[PDB]
Amino acid sequence: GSSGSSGLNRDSVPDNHPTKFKVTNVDDEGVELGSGVMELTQSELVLHLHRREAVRWPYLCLRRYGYDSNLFSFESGRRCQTGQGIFAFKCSRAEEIFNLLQDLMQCNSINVMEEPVIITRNSHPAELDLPRAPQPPNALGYTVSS
Amino acid sequence: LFRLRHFPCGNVNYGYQQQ
Incomplete structure (x- = not known):
């Protein structure tokens, strides 16, 4: 829970922004590959980066979302732009993003915007993902006669 | 967008249980 709106223009996004957080995409080792900004x-x-595509x-999709010392990553399926695969990044306020993530996820913003x-939209049928499914019950044996 | 083998984190608060 938070609020506060002002009519002041921004010059350069800080490294400690409440809504923004400058992250650094790293590799398994943890090295720095490229810089980016998470929103x-x-x-x-x-994610924001050089002229390159965003x-x-x-x-x-986000199935699991955790956090760790200057370390933040998330698991995504294969239906996402990028595709199947995990992506981690090094930041200074990873926790902040982790404590906020569960804040926006729970809200499950329902078409909040038009x-x-x-x-x-209703159209010809196609290979569309399927919902969840219940668990199958058990069976009961029977007694034997004389 | 480096591809990782597994999640480097251990403490995660699963949110969406849908595919």
Whole structure:
């Protein structure tokens, strides 16, 4: 829970922004490959980088989201732009993003904003993911006669 | 977007249980 809006223009995003957090995509070893900025908006997680193309990650797919000392990563399926694979990044306020992530996820923002037309619309059937399913019960044997 | 083999973290608070 938080609030506070002001009509002041921003010059340069700080390294301790409440909504923004400068991250550094690292490798298994932890080395620094490229710099980027992570955004935590009710909408979804979006990474910013050089002229290169950007990326986005829907809070939905996000199956697991943890944190650690100057270490933050998330697991995504194969339906996401990037695709199947994990991505970790080195930051200074990883916890902050972790404590906020569960804040936007729980809110499950329901079309909070008027979104444009999406395939979701009723149309020809196709290979679309499937929902959850219940667990199958057990069976009962029987007694033997004389 | 380096590809990792496994999650370097251990304490995670699973949120979405849907595929």
